[PDB]
Amino acid sequence: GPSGMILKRAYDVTPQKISTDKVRGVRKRVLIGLKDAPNFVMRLFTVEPGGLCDRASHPWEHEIFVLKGKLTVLKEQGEETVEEGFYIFVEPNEIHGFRNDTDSEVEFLDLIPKEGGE
Amino acid sequence: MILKRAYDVTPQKISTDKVRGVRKRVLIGLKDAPNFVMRLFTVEPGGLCDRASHPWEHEIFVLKGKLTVLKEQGEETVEEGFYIFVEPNEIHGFRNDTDSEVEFLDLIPKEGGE
Ligand SMILES: [Cu+2]
Ligand SMILES: [Cu+2]
């Protein structure tokens, strides 16, 4: 594939609204997307106050790192709170979701294998 | 599901012919990862990862500080909030010319180990 290196301010990407049956109040920046990624993609999610990614599962993993704020993680059985500086590994097919129960935006990095899209 | 404070993962001091003044935390490693691994590097003041290359990419996010990125020729300094995509085989390295620790997240495909 191509050579080189990209160095870019993540906020130079405009956060795009995500709106699905399960997702409301969330925006996403694609940092390293399908047009460039050899194996896996890097996105930066912003969860607005009250925003929700309701419980779901899918046949690929997540690797997440929380950049800003206090995030509620929805699990099969209950919920748990994380904050800036936490990482999360979600196994393939594990039930998960996210909610922002605070007044300010939450941001996290989210990487998935590229077979799961961007 | 694993939910953990990255700080609580024990850092490893890296010391090689190319690397000095660097610590590495393996957050999501080979025992867990289906496809790619997540590490968190801390570069001490004056720390250096000298130019190298390998047949896998990096996907990096700068968490703290001003990171000097070494390129095949020359260098570029970036700061917290930058991401870095290093294509496979591209020469790269890192240095911290500042007086405080620099941290960055670094993900590689599992073929690169952890
Ligand atoms: Cu998911
Ligand atoms: Cu490297």
Side-chain angles (χ1 to χ4, degrees), chain B residues 63-110:
Chain B
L63 297 169
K64 177 177 168 181
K66 295 186 99 107
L67 180 64
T68 303
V69 182
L70 308 183
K71 296 188 171 186
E72 184 179 9
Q73 191 188 8
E75 57 188 49
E76 177 175 345
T77 303
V78 301
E79 68 188 348
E80 170 189 344
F82 273 65
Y83 73 93
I84 304 167
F85 172 49
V86 186
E87 290 280 14
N89 295 78
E90 189 66 28
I91 293 167
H92 61 286
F94 301 104
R95 195 176 67 245
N96 180 1
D97 290 334
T98 80
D99 299 327
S100 50
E101 287 185 342
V102 166
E103 294 179 7
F104 59 92
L105 206 67
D106 190 328
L107 301 98
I108 61 171
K110 67 183 183 188

mmCIF file of all heavy atoms in Angstrom, chain B residues 63-110:
data_model
loop_
_atom_site.group_PDB
_atom_site.id
_atom_site.type_symbol
_atom_site.label_atom_id
_atom_site.label_comp_id
_atom_site.label_asym_id
_atom_site.label_seq_id
_atom_site.Cartn_x
_atom_site.Cartn_y
_atom_site.Cartn_z
ATOM 1 N N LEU B 63 -2.039 12.183 23.783
ATOM 2 C CA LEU B 63 -2.836 12.448 24.959
ATOM 3 C C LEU B 63 -2.353 13.617 25.802
ATOM 4 O O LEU B 63 -3.177 14.277 26.439
ATOM 5 C CB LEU B 63 -2.867 11.204 25.861
ATOM 6 C CG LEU B 63 -3.518 9.963 25.263
ATOM 7 C CD1 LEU B 63 -3.247 8.753 26.152
ATOM 8 C CD2 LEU B 63 -5.000 10.172 25.032
ATOM 9 N N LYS B 64 -1.055 13.872 25.815
ATOM 10 C CA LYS B 64 -0.473 14.853 26.723
ATOM 11 C C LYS B 64 0.855 15.322 26.135
ATOM 12 O O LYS B 64 1.716 14.506 25.816
ATOM 13 C CB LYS B 64 -0.232 14.223 28.102
ATOM 14 C CG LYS B 64 0.443 15.140 29.116
ATOM 15 C CD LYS B 64 0.568 14.463 30.473
ATOM 16 C CE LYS B 64 1.475 15.196 31.439
ATOM 17 N NZ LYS B 64 1.564 14.474 32.737
ATOM 18 N N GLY B 65 1.024 16.641 26.087
ATOM 19 C CA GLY B 65 2.312 17.191 25.764
ATOM 20 C C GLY B 65 2.563 17.405 24.287
ATOM 21 O O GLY B 65 1.712 17.274 23.429
ATOM 22 N N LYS B 66 3.817 17.770 24.026
ATOM 23 C CA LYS B 66 4.319 18.070 22.684
ATOM 24 C C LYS B 66 5.306 16.977 22.271
ATOM 25 O O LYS B 66 6.399 16.842 22.836
ATOM 26 C CB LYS B 66 4.945 19.459 22.643
ATOM 27 C CG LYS B 66 3.957 20.590 22.886
ATOM 28 C CD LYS B 66 4.627 21.942 22.677
ATOM 29 C CE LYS B 66 4.331 22.509 21.303
ATOM 30 N NZ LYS B 66 3.370 23.649 21.355
ATOM 31 N N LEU B 67 4.880 16.205 21.274
ATOM 32 C CA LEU B 67 5.602 15.031 20.781
ATOM 33 C C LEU B 67 6.345 15.429 19.524
ATOM 34 O O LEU B 67 5.751 15.872 18.524
ATOM 35 C CB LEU B 67 4.622 13.897 20.486
ATOM 36 C CG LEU B 67 5.196 12.585 19.957
ATOM 37 C CD1 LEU B 67 6.093 11.932 20.982
ATOM 38 C CD2 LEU B 67 4.072 11.639 19.553
ATOM 39 N N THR B 68 7.657 15.223 19.486
ATOM 40 C CA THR B 68 8.422 15.369 18.245
ATOM 41 C C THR B 68 8.421 14.047 17.501
ATOM 42 O O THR B 68 8.808 13.024 18.059
ATOM 43 C CB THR B 68 9.865 15.816 18.545
ATOM 44 O OG1 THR B 68 9.785 17.055 19.295
ATOM 45 C CG2 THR B 68 10.633 16.048 17.260
ATOM 46 N N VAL B 69 7.973 14.089 16.253
ATOM 47 C CA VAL B 69 7.887 12.908 15.399
ATOM 48 C C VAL B 69 9.036 12.950 14.397
ATOM 49 O O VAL B 69 9.160 13.910 13.640
ATOM 50 C CB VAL B 69 6.523 12.820 14.713
ATOM 51 C CG1 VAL B 69 6.448 11.559 13.881
ATOM 52 C CG2 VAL B 69 5.392 12.911 15.710
ATOM 53 N N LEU B 70 9.866 11.934 14.439
ATOM 54 C CA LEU B 70 10.964 11.788 13.484
ATOM 55 C C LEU B 70 10.422 11.137 12.214
ATOM 56 O O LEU B 70 9.757 10.114 12.276
ATOM 57 C CB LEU B 70 12.051 10.916 14.089
ATOM 58 C CG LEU B 70 12.572 11.290 15.465
ATOM 59 C CD1 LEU B 70 13.690 10.397 15.929
ATOM 60 C CD2 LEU B 70 12.986 12.749 15.476
ATOM 61 N N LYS B 71 10.785 11.714 11.084
ATOM 62 C CA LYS B 71 10.416 11.210 9.764
ATOM 63 C C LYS B 71 11.653 10.743 9.038
ATOM 64 O O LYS B 71 12.762 10.959 9.524
ATOM 65 C CB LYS B 71 9.742 12.319 8.973
ATOM 66 C CG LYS B 71 8.433 12.756 9.594
ATOM 67 C CD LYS B 71 7.699 13.727 8.685
ATOM 68 C CE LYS B 71 6.301 14.033 9.143
ATOM 69 N NZ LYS B 71 5.538 14.876 8.192
ATOM 70 N N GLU B 72 11.496 10.163 7.847
ATOM 71 C CA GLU B 72 12.684 9.617 7.177
ATOM 72 C C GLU B 72 13.802 10.635 7.106
ATOM 73 O O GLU B 72 14.954 10.338 7.464
ATOM 74 C CB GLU B 72 12.324 9.029 5.803
ATOM 75 C CG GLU B 72 13.557 8.374 5.173
ATOM 76 C CD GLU B 72 13.296 7.738 3.833
ATOM 77 O OE1 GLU B 72 12.178 7.926 3.265
ATOM 78 O OE2 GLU B 72 14.234 7.074 3.315
ATOM 79 N N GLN B 73 13.418 11.838 6.683
ATOM 80 C CA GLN B 73 14.257 13.019 6.867
ATOM 81 C C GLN B 73 13.486 14.083 7.655
ATOM 82 O O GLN B 73 12.309 14.387 7.448
ATOM 83 C CB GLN B 73 14.660 13.562 5.499
ATOM 84 C CG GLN B 73 15.739 14.632 5.612
ATOM 85 C CD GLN B 73 15.999 15.305 4.288
ATOM 86 O OE1 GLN B 73 15.269 15.061 3.328
ATOM 87 N NE2 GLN B 73 17.032 16.127 4.261
ATOM 88 N N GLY B 74 14.170 14.678 8.599
ATOM 89 C CA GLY B 74 13.525 15.741 9.346
ATOM 90 C C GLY B 74 12.527 15.267 10.400
ATOM 91 O O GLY B 74 12.439 14.085 10.710
ATOM 92 N N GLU B 75 11.801 16.223 10.957
ATOM 93 C CA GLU B 75 10.928 15.947 12.097
ATOM 94 C C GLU B 75 9.811 16.969 12.114
ATOM 95 O O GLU B 75 9.854 18.027 11.459
ATOM 96 C CB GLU B 75 11.732 15.875 13.388
ATOM 97 C CG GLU B 75 12.536 17.082 13.719
ATOM 98 C CD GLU B 75 13.488 17.008 14.880
ATOM 99 O OE1 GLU B 75 14.307 16.078 15.045
ATOM 100 O OE2 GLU B 75 13.445 17.960 15.676
ATOM 101 N N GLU B 76 8.746 16.690 12.837
ATOM 102 C CA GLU B 76 7.548 17.502 12.989
ATOM 103 C C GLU B 76 7.045 17.388 14.425
ATOM 104 O O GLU B 76 6.858 16.266 14.884
ATOM 105 C CB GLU B 76 6.436 17.086 12.009
ATOM 106 C CG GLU B 76 5.134 17.820 12.128
ATOM 107 C CD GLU B 76 4.060 17.527 11.117
ATOM 108 O OE1 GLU B 76 4.321 16.924 10.052
ATOM 109 O OE2 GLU B 76 2.904 17.909 11.420
ATOM 110 N N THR B 77 6.766 18.487 15.073
ATOM 111 C CA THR B 77 6.244 18.442 16.442
ATOM 112 C C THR B 77 4.737 18.599 16.410
ATOM 113 O O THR B 77 4.243 19.501 15.748
ATOM 114 C CB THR B 77 6.924 19.467 17.350
ATOM 115 O OG1 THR B 77 8.343 19.245 17.341
ATOM 116 C CG2 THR B 77 6.482 19.311 18.800
ATOM 117 N N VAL B 78 4.048 17.768 17.174
ATOM 118 C CA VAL B 78 2.592 17.822 17.301
ATOM 119 C C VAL B 78 2.258 17.848 18.775
ATOM 120 O O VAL B 78 3.120 17.815 19.635
ATOM 121 C CB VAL B 78 1.920 16.654 16.565
ATOM 122 C CG1 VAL B 78 2.282 16.671 15.089
ATOM 123 C CG2 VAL B 78 2.288 15.343 17.234
ATOM 124 N N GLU B 79 0.991 17.948 19.126
ATOM 125 C CA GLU B 79 0.629 18.096 20.533
ATOM 126 C C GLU B 79 -0.644 17.329 20.797
ATOM 127 O O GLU B 79 -1.232 16.703 19.931
ATOM 128 C CB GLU B 79 0.513 19.557 20.904
ATOM 129 C CG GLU B 79 -0.649 20.258 20.247
ATOM 130 C CD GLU B 79 -0.582 21.753 20.502
ATOM 131 O OE1 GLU B 79 0.227 22.176 21.358
ATOM 132 O OE2 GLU B 79 -1.320 22.497 19.821
ATOM 133 N N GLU B 80 -1.013 17.364 22.080
ATOM 134 C CA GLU B 80 -2.225 16.704 22.546
ATOM 135 C C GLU B 80 -3.360 17.014 21.574
ATOM 136 O O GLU B 80 -3.592 18.162 21.185
ATOM 137 C CB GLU B 80 -2.578 17.137 23.952
ATOM 138 C CG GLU B 80 -3.920 16.713 24.483
ATOM 139 C CD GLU B 80 -4.390 17.284 25.796
ATOM 140 O OE1 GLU B 80 -3.595 17.839 26.572
ATOM 141 O OE2 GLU B 80 -5.610 17.141 26.044
ATOM 142 N N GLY B 81 -4.112 15.991 21.222
ATOM 143 C CA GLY B 81 -5.249 16.135 20.342
ATOM 144 C C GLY B 81 -4.949 15.846 18.884
ATOM 145 O O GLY B 81 -5.889 15.838 18.074
ATOM 146 N N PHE B 82 -3.701 15.606 18.536
ATOM 147 C CA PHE B 82 -3.335 15.105 17.225
ATOM 148 C C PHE B 82 -3.459 13.594 17.171
ATOM 149 O O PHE B 82 -3.112 12.911 18.133
ATOM 150 C CB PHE B 82 -1.896 15.454 16.844
ATOM 151 C CG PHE B 82 -1.706 16.795 16.192
ATOM 152 C CD1 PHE B 82 -1.966 17.963 16.873
ATOM 153 C CD2 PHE B 82 -1.267 16.898 14.889
ATOM 154 C CE1 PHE B 82 -1.723 19.198 16.288
ATOM 155 C CE2 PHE B 82 -1.072 18.117 14.265
ATOM 156 C CZ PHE B 82 -1.359 19.278 14.955
ATOM 157 N N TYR B 83 -3.896 13.089 16.031
ATOM 158 C CA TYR B 83 -3.692 11.685 15.681
ATOM 159 C C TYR B 83 -2.606 11.580 14.615
ATOM 160 O O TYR B 83 -2.288 12.514 13.888
ATOM 161 C CB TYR B 83 -4.993 11.038 15.245
ATOM 162 C CG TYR B 83 -5.527 11.427 13.893
ATOM 163 C CD1 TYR B 83 -5.228 10.692 12.758
ATOM 164 C CD2 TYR B 83 -6.342 12.562 13.747
ATOM 165 C CE1 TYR B 83 -5.720 11.044 11.511
ATOM 166 C CE2 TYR B 83 -6.833 12.899 12.502
ATOM 167 C CZ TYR B 83 -6.510 12.166 11.387
ATOM 168 O OH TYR B 83 -7.044 12.548 10.177
ATOM 169 N N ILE B 84 -2.002 10.399 14.608
ATOM 170 C CA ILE B 84 -0.907 10.059 13.717
ATOM 171 C C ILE B 84 -1.188 8.701 13.108
ATOM 172 O O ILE B 84 -1.473 7.734 13.815
ATOM 173 C CB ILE B 84 0.462 10.063 14.422
ATOM 174 C CG1 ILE B 84 0.729 11.417 15.104
ATOM 175 C CG2 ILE B 84 1.569 9.679 13.451
ATOM 176 C CD1 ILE B 84 1.889 11.455 16.071
ATOM 177 N N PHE B 85 -1.130 8.630 11.793
ATOM 178 C CA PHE B 85 -1.243 7.367 11.061
ATOM 179 C C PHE B 85 0.094 7.131 10.383
ATOM 180 O O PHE B 85 0.476 7.917 9.507
ATOM 181 C CB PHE B 85 -2.373 7.422 10.052
ATOM 182 C CG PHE B 85 -2.449 6.244 9.129
ATOM 183 C CD1 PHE B 85 -2.395 4.943 9.592
ATOM 184 C CD2 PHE B 85 -2.574 6.430 7.759
ATOM 185 C CE1 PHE B 85 -2.466 3.864 8.723
ATOM 186 C CE2 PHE B 85 -2.649 5.370 6.887
ATOM 187 C CZ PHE B 85 -2.571 4.078 7.354
ATOM 188 N N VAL B 86 0.812 6.083 10.752
ATOM 189 C CA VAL B 86 2.104 5.740 10.134
ATOM 190 C C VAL B 86 1.873 4.531 9.254
ATOM 191 O O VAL B 86 1.500 3.459 9.726
ATOM 192 C CB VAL B 86 3.199 5.455 11.175
ATOM 193 C CG1 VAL B 86 4.521 5.248 10.443
ATOM 194 C CG2 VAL B 86 3.303 6.540 12.225
ATOM 195 N N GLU B 87 2.047 4.681 7.930
ATOM 196 C CA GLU B 87 1.866 3.555 7.021
ATOM 197 C C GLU B 87 2.878 2.464 7.336
ATOM 198 O O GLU B 87 3.992 2.733 7.824
ATOM 199 C CB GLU B 87 2.048 4.023 5.581
ATOM 200 C CG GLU B 87 0.933 4.919 5.063
ATOM 201 C CD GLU B 87 -0.306 4.201 4.626
ATOM 202 O OE1 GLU B 87 -0.496 3.000 4.935
ATOM 203 O OE2 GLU B 87 -1.137 4.891 3.941
ATOM 204 N N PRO B 88 2.570 1.221 6.987
ATOM 205 C CA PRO B 88 3.573 0.142 7.089
ATOM 206 C C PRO B 88 4.845 0.564 6.379
ATOM 207 O O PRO B 88 4.817 1.154 5.304
ATOM 208 C CB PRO B 88 2.882 -1.041 6.403
ATOM 209 C CG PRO B 88 1.432 -0.772 6.587
ATOM 210 C CD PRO B 88 1.319 0.724 6.382
ATOM 211 N N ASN B 89 5.980 0.236 6.997
ATOM 212 C CA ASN B 89 7.317 0.388 6.470
ATOM 213 C C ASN B 89 7.817 1.816 6.464
ATOM 214 O O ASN B 89 9.000 2.036 6.176
ATOM 215 C CB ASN B 89 7.477 -0.197 5.050
ATOM 216 C CG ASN B 89 7.267 -1.694 5.162
ATOM 217 O OD1 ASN B 89 6.186 -2.215 5.262
ATOM 218 N ND2 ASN B 89 8.372 -2.392 5.276
ATOM 219 N N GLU B 90 7.017 2.792 6.852
ATOM 220 C CA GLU B 90 7.503 4.169 6.858
ATOM 221 C C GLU B 90 8.472 4.370 8.010
ATOM 222 O O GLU B 90 8.165 3.963 9.143
ATOM 223 C CB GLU B 90 6.316 5.130 6.951
ATOM 224 C CG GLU B 90 6.757 6.574 6.740
ATOM 225 C CD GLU B 90 7.270 6.812 5.338
ATOM 226 O OE1 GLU B 90 6.853 6.131 4.367
ATOM 227 O OE2 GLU B 90 8.168 7.661 5.166
ATOM 228 N N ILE B 91 9.604 5.004 7.781
ATOM 229 C CA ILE B 91 10.552 5.313 8.865
ATOM 230 C C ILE B 91 9.914 6.319 9.789
ATOM 231 O O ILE B 91 9.347 7.334 9.384
ATOM 232 C CB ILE B 91 11.880 5.797 8.267
ATOM 233 C CG1 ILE B 91 12.542 4.630 7.508
ATOM 234 C CG2 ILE B 91 12.800 6.372 9.335
ATOM 235 C CD1 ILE B 91 13.704 5.002 6.611
ATOM 236 N N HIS B 92 10.043 6.053 11.099
ATOM 237 C CA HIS B 92 9.466 6.926 12.108
ATOM 238 C C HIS B 92 10.204 6.762 13.418
ATOM 239 O O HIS B 92 10.832 5.737 13.678
ATOM 240 C CB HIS B 92 7.964 6.609 12.308
ATOM 241 C CG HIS B 92 7.730 5.202 12.781
ATOM 242 N ND1 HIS B 92 7.873 4.136 11.945
ATOM 243 C CD2 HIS B 92 7.519 4.666 13.992
ATOM 244 C CE1 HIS B 92 7.708 3.023 12.630
ATOM 245 N NE2 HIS B 92 7.476 3.292 13.890
ATOM 246 N N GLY B 93 10.052 7.753 14.281
ATOM 247 C CA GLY B 93 10.503 7.688 15.666
ATOM 248 C C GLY B 93 9.933 8.845 16.424
ATOM 249 O O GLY B 93 9.131 9.611 15.867
ATOM 250 N N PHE B 94 10.311 8.977 17.684
ATOM 251 C CA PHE B 94 9.679 9.940 18.579
ATOM 252 C C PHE B 94 10.723 10.510 19.536
ATOM 253 O O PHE B 94 11.618 9.780 19.950
ATOM 254 C CB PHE B 94 8.556 9.245 19.372
ATOM 255 C CG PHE B 94 7.507 8.646 18.480
ATOM 256 C CD1 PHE B 94 7.499 7.278 18.277
ATOM 257 C CD2 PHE B 94 6.564 9.436 17.840
ATOM 258 C CE1 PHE B 94 6.583 6.686 17.425
ATOM 259 C CE2 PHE B 94 5.643 8.839 17.002
ATOM 260 C CZ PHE B 94 5.668 7.485 16.765
ATOM 261 N N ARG B 95 10.537 11.758 19.920
ATOM 262 C CA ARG B 95 11.409 12.378 20.920
ATOM 263 C C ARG B 95 10.620 13.371 21.725
ATOM 264 O O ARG B 95 9.650 13.965 21.241
ATOM 265 C CB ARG B 95 12.615 13.040 20.241
ATOM 266 C CG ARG B 95 13.764 13.410 21.157
ATOM 267 C CD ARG B 95 14.994 13.970 20.430
ATOM 268 N NE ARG B 95 14.715 15.254 19.815
ATOM 269 C CZ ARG B 95 14.692 15.627 18.561
ATOM 270 N NH1 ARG B 95 15.080 14.815 17.590
ATOM 271 N NH2 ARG B 95 14.331 16.883 18.242
ATOM 272 N N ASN B 96 11.007 13.549 22.982
ATOM 273 C CA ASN B 96 10.403 14.571 23.833
ATOM 274 C C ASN B 96 11.449 15.633 24.166
ATOM 275 O O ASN B 96 12.348 15.392 24.971
ATOM 276 C CB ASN B 96 9.864 13.955 25.124
ATOM 277 C CG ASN B 96 9.215 14.934 26.064
ATOM 278 O OD1 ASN B 96 9.125 16.126 25.764
ATOM 279 N ND2 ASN B 96 8.748 14.440 27.209
ATOM 280 N N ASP B 97 11.346 16.794 23.545
ATOM 281 C CA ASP B 97 12.268 17.904 23.789
ATOM 282 C C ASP B 97 11.796 18.850 24.889
ATOM 283 O O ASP B 97 12.478 19.842 25.179
ATOM 284 C CB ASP B 97 12.470 18.717 22.510
ATOM 285 C CG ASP B 97 13.256 17.961 21.469
ATOM 286 O OD1 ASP B 97 14.059 17.066 21.810
ATOM 287 O OD2 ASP B 97 13.040 18.249 20.274
ATOM 288 N N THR B 98 10.676 18.546 25.509
ATOM 289 C CA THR B 98 10.100 19.409 26.531
ATOM 290 C C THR B 98 10.553 18.978 27.917
ATOM 291 O O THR B 98 11.249 17.981 28.109
ATOM 292 C CB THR B 98 8.563 19.434 26.469
ATOM 293 O OG1 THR B 98 8.027 18.269 27.107
ATOM 294 C CG2 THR B 98 8.040 19.516 25.042
ATOM 295 N N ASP B 99 10.114 19.732 28.929
ATOM 296 C CA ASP B 99 10.489 19.465 30.310
ATOM 297 C C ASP B 99 9.452 18.646 31.073
ATOM 298 O O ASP B 99 9.625 18.446 32.278
ATOM 299 C CB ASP B 99 10.747 20.766 31.079
ATOM 300 C CG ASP B 99 11.865 21.603 30.502
ATOM 301 O OD1 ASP B 99 12.834 21.031 29.969
ATOM 302 O OD2 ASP B 99 11.746 22.840 30.653
ATOM 303 N N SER B 100 8.388 18.190 30.442
ATOM 304 C CA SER B 100 7.378 17.383 31.143
ATOM 305 C C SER B 100 7.023 16.165 30.293
ATOM 306 O O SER B 100 7.252 16.144 29.086
ATOM 307 C CB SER B 100 6.153 18.246 31.439
ATOM 308 O OG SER B 100 5.754 18.903 30.243
ATOM 309 N N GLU B 101 6.488 15.130 30.922
ATOM 310 C CA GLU B 101 6.208 13.871 30.251
ATOM 311 C C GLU B 101 5.189 14.039 29.134
ATOM 312 O O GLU B 101 4.246 14.805 29.266
ATOM 313 C CB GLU B 101 5.640 12.864 31.261
ATOM 314 C CG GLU B 101 6.702 12.342 32.199
ATOM 315 C CD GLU B 101 6.261 11.264 33.160
ATOM 316 O OE1 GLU B 101 5.036 11.107 33.377
ATOM 317 O OE2 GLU B 101 7.169 10.576 33.698
ATOM 318 N N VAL B 102 5.411 13.295 28.064
ATOM 319 C CA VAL B 102 4.519 13.198 26.915
ATOM 320 C C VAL B 102 3.870 11.821 26.948
ATOM 321 O O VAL B 102 4.535 10.839 27.245
ATOM 322 C CB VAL B 102 5.293 13.462 25.624
ATOM 323 C CG1 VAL B 102 4.493 13.039 24.398
ATOM 324 C CG2 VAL B 102 5.715 14.923 25.561
ATOM 325 N N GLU B 103 2.565 11.755 26.661
ATOM 326 C CA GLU B 103 1.873 10.468 26.584
ATOM 327 C C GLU B 103 1.115 10.366 25.268
ATOM 328 O O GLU B 103 0.508 11.326 24.779
ATOM 329 C CB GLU B 103 0.871 10.308 27.734
ATOM 330 C CG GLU B 103 1.521 10.222 29.097
ATOM 331 C CD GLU B 103 0.579 10.090 30.262
ATOM 332 O OE1 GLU B 103 -0.633 9.924 30.036
ATOM 333 O OE2 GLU B 103 1.011 10.179 31.419
ATOM 334 N N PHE B 104 1.106 9.139 24.728
ATOM 335 C CA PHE B 104 0.325 8.897 23.529
ATOM 336 C C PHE B 104 -0.176 7.453 23.538
ATOM 337 O O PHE B 104 0.487 6.528 24.025
ATOM 338 C CB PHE B 104 1.083 9.193 22.247
ATOM 339 C CG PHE B 104 2.354 8.449 21.959
ATOM 340 C CD1 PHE B 104 2.307 7.276 21.212
ATOM 341 C CD2 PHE B 104 3.593 8.931 22.369
ATOM 342 C CE1 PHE B 104 3.473 6.598 20.876
ATOM 343 C CE2 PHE B 104 4.752 8.266 22.015
ATOM 344 C CZ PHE B 104 4.690 7.101 21.280
ATOM 345 N N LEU B 105 -1.368 7.286 22.982
ATOM 346 C CA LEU B 105 -1.957 5.988 22.721
ATOM 347 C C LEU B 105 -1.391 5.478 21.397
ATOM 348 O O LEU B 105 -1.214 6.271 20.457
ATOM 349 C CB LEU B 105 -3.482 6.110 22.654
ATOM 350 C CG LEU B 105 -4.310 4.899 22.986
ATOM 351 C CD1 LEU B 105 -4.129 4.562 24.464
ATOM 352 C CD2 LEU B 105 -5.767 5.153 22.602
ATOM 353 N N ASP B 106 -1.145 4.186 21.306
ATOM 354 C CA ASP B 106 -0.532 3.599 20.127
ATOM 355 C C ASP B 106 -1.126 2.217 19.909
ATOM 356 O O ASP B 106 -0.988 1.351 20.769
ATOM 357 C CB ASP B 106 0.970 3.502 20.354
ATOM 358 C CG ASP B 106 1.835 3.139 19.216
ATOM 359 O OD1 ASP B 106 1.337 2.379 18.385
ATOM 360 O OD2 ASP B 106 2.990 3.664 19.117
ATOM 361 N N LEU B 107 -1.752 2.051 18.769
ATOM 362 C CA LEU B 107 -2.349 0.780 18.378
ATOM 363 C C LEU B 107 -1.674 0.254 17.131
ATOM 364 O O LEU B 107 -1.398 0.978 16.176
ATOM 365 C CB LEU B 107 -3.857 0.932 18.169
ATOM 366 C CG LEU B 107 -4.618 1.435 19.418
ATOM 367 C CD1 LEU B 107 -4.874 2.915 19.383
ATOM 368 C CD2 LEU B 107 -5.868 0.602 19.624
ATOM 369 N N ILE B 108 -1.421 -1.073 17.151
ATOM 370 C CA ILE B 108 -0.806 -1.800 16.049
ATOM 371 C C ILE B 108 -1.562 -3.080 15.821
ATOM 372 O O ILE B 108 -2.144 -3.649 16.754
ATOM 373 C CB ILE B 108 0.686 -2.068 16.314
ATOM 374 C CG1 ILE B 108 0.921 -2.918 17.563
ATOM 375 C CG2 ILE B 108 1.498 -0.781 16.367
ATOM 376 C CD1 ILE B 108 2.356 -3.377 17.709
ATOM 377 N N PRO B 109 -1.540 -3.633 14.600
ATOM 378 C CA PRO B 109 -2.109 -4.956 14.409
ATOM 379 C C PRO B 109 -1.315 -5.998 15.169
ATOM 380 O O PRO B 109 -0.136 -5.843 15.441
ATOM 381 C CB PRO B 109 -2.017 -5.177 12.895
ATOM 382 C CG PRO B 109 -0.951 -4.262 12.439
ATOM 383 C CD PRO B 109 -0.882 -3.100 13.392
ATOM 384 N N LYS B 110 -2.001 -7.083 15.556
ATOM 385 C CA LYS B 110 -1.390 -8.052 16.463
ATOM 386 C C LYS B 110 -0.157 -8.726 15.876
ATOM 387 O O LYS B 110 0.664 -9.246 16.651
ATOM 388 C CB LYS B 110 -2.424 -9.089 16.909
ATOM 389 C CG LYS B 110 -2.903 -10.005 15.799
ATOM 390 C CD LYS B 110 -3.983 -10.961 16.256
ATOM 391 C CE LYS B 110 -4.412 -11.925 15.152
ATOM 392 N NZ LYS B 110 -5.591 -12.761 15.501
#
